[PDB]
Structure 1
Amino acid sequence: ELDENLFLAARNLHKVDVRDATGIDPVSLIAFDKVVMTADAVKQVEEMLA
């Protein structure tokens, strides 16, 4: 779930992006050096990709 606090804290950082796990896109996953997923986010992407 998009935690508004984290999103606010991140959106002036430099290389850091915060997503919703329904807003992931092919280019973003390749562009950034590292991807951090919360476990529930992994579950949502699991069911979404089926």
Structure 2
Amino acid sequence: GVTFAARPQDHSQKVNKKMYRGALKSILSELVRQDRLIVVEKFSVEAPKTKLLAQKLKDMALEDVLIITGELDENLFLAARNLHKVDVRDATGIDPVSLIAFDKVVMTADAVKQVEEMLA
């Protein structure tokens, strides 16, 4: 055998809610201080085509970015599932690790309202 064999162990830590929310407040403030955050009103496209999405990101001069929405669009999520450097998410489903990892973050203004309401 092994001298001390391994067991299926849960590595789930416990995160305090205020610590989590303060980390997110600080992480977005540091994104703004790094000038890595852009806010617009509308961001969508009415066809499920990665060609159109990549052309729009070229027109916006964007390479490794993070999309967040007010509410979620069928074609927008379909157009960036297959794009590795781009993740499209609802404003509820956020993580600080992907808030760091992607080079710039772009936000719907309704999503900004939902985030600032959700943090308070």
User: Which TM-score tier does this pair reach, normalised by the shorter chain?
Assistant: over 0.9
Report the alpha carbon displacement of residue 9 of structure 1 after superposing the two structures with TM.
0.6
Q: TM-score, normalised by structure 2?
A: 0.41
Give the drift of 1:26.
1.0
Give the TM-score normalised by structure 1: 0.93
Q: Which has more helix, going by share of residues?
A: 1
Match of residue 13 from structure 1: 83
- Computed over aligned residues only, the root mean square deviation of the Cα atoms, in angstroms, reads 0.6
Moved over 4 A (4+): none
Question: Percent of pairs identical after alignment?
Answer: 100
Deviation at 1:27, TM superposition (A): 0.7
Separation of aligned partners in 1, 2:94 and 2:84:
18
Distance 1:14 1:29 in 2: 15
Q: Structure 1 regions of 5+ residues with no counterpart?
A: none
Q: How big is each residue's C-alpha offset from its partner over 1:1-50, in whole Å with a ceiling of 9 and x where there is no partner?
A: 01111000100012000010000111110010010101000000000011
Distance (Å, rounded) in 2 between the aligned partners of 1:4 and 1:27: 25
**Distance in 2 (alpha carbons) for counterparts of 1:27 and 1:21:** 15
The whole-number CA distance in structure 2 between the counterparts of 1:47 and 1:26 is 18
How many residues are aligned here?
50
CA–CA separation in structure 2 for the residues paired with 1:44 and 1:10: 22
The unaligned stretches of length 5 or more in structure 2 are: 1-70
Which protein shows a greater Rg? 2
1 CA distance for matches of 2:90 and 2:114? 10
